[PDB]
Amino acid sequence: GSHSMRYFHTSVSRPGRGEPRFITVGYVDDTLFVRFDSDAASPREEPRAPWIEQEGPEYWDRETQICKAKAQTDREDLRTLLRYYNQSEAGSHTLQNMYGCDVGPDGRLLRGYHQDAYDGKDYIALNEDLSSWTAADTAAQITQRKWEAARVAEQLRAYLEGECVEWLRRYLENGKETLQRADPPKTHVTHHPISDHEATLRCWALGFYPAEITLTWQRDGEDQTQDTELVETRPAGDRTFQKWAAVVVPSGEEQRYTCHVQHEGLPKPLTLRWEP
């Protein structure tokens, strides 16, 4: 189907405790494949998926150089942002960046991204045109002016439409065993008495990849959204994900409730009921 490649970056200042820590990770879809941490003993970008291990020494050297240089520019950026926000040097602050591409089944660019956040808030984002910017505030407009002057968007567009897309195609081929395999959810319903008057029904989805899934409960065919406890999809640690959805069911109503499961690894959505 469609696919994505994303790089995530976080720098966190720590005044009086050395220089900001820089951590970046790369994903294809929901698969982590590279990481770099400036607090490592010998910081290098390191593989995290089997299909990237075959890249040769020039790849790792180049990627490591890019990471180290971004750690440095982020430290300069944290200093600039203290100025732009009139902040003191005393506190810890955070700078986040994400960029990458989404492609369709034919490998063509669907959308590119490049966006930043400061202290957990949107700061500046490249728009979907890959040519203009959305600045969150008057500080980010100062950045936008500089990036317009320097034609930064054009350099990002060139990467996002070219290299980004081409790397993702390469990775999807080299990783075709796993990146191009959906693992469907393993599903079941459990029953948990609460009192004489009610019990929880919990609908489980386990072992699935990728992470996107829809789990819902209906009663007499009506969605129970407001009355469903839906936990965040969570990693199992074996590449796969888990999720559950629970409803509080009055005594004797169990067969009126149905759980519905949608996932790309399922040829047809599933319907499940409690089976005593």
Binding site: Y7, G26, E63, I66, A69, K70, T73, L156, Y159, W167
Partner: peptide, 9 residues
């Protein structure tokens, strides 16, 4: 593979 263009805010 990563973007190589240095960018400062």
């Amino acid at each position: 593979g990563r973007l190589n263009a240095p960018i400062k805010v």
